[PDB]
Amino acid sequence: KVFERCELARTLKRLGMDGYRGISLANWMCLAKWESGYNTRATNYNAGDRSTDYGIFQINSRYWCNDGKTPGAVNACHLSCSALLQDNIADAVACAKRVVRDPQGIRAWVAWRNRCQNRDVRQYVQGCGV
Ligand SMILES: CC(=O)N[C@@H]1[C@@H](O)[C@H](O[C@@H]2O[C@H](CO)[C@@H](O[C@@H]3O[C@H](CO)[C@@H](O[C@@H]4O[C@H](CO)[C@@H](O)[C@H](O)[C@H]4NC(C)=O)[C@H](O)[C@H]3NC(C)=O)[C@H](O)[C@H]2NC(C)=O)[C@@H](CO)O[C@H]1O
Ligand SMILES: [Cl-]
Ligand SMILES: [Cl-]
Numbered sequence: 001k002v003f004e005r006c007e008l009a010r011t012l013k014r015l016g017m018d019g020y021r022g023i024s025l026a027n028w029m030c031l032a033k034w035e036s037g038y039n040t041r042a043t044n045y046n047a048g049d050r051s052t053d054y055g056i057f058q059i060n061s062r063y064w065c066n067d068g069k070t071p072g073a074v075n076a077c078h079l080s081c082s083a084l085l086q087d088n089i090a091d092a093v094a095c096a097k098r099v100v101r102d103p104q105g106i107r108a109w110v111a112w113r114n115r116c117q118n119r120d121v122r123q124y125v126q127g128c129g130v
Helices: 005-014 025-036 081-085 090-100 110-115
Strands: 043-046 051-054
Touching: 005 025, 025 110, 051 081, 081 090
Parallel strands: none
Antiparallel strands: 043 051
């Protein structure tokens, strides 16, 4: 499913992402926007290292979910990567929360550094009622 901006912001707020491990809701919104355009079925194969990025947050198979075909991978979220392609984002959110419990936090996504860090991210949540 492709979420509408404010529909996603309200969903993420109900799922407890606002301020999770110090990350504001607008930062999560900025990340989803640049990673997948708010699309849960998005996938990106990284031919250079044989891993795949899955779902609305483009979570990588080398560390976070199991797809079976990525060499030397682990599955820290304890999920099949298929779980990250559902229209319901509860599993993807639980996984994203796990990602930021590691030391890099939100920096785990290079798109966040390029597109969101030190920017005015209020634009992503303006007028959504969150
Ligand atoms: C070419 C390209 O840009 N590909 C993109 C992917 O790079 C990108 O996904 C991110 O990939 C990075 C790079 O490896 C990955 O970072 C690693 O994350 C693990 C897990 O947190 C780290 O390992 C942990 O380190 C701490 C430090 O002590 C330990 O506490 C813990 O035991 C370690 N766990 C493991 C399993 O090793 C690595 O240190 C870290 N490596 C580096 C170099 O920083 C990110 O997690 C990936 N991010 C996500 C969200 O999956 C992907 C994201 O969209 O985009 C591809 O296109
Ligand atoms: Cl699963
Ligand atoms: Cl699995």
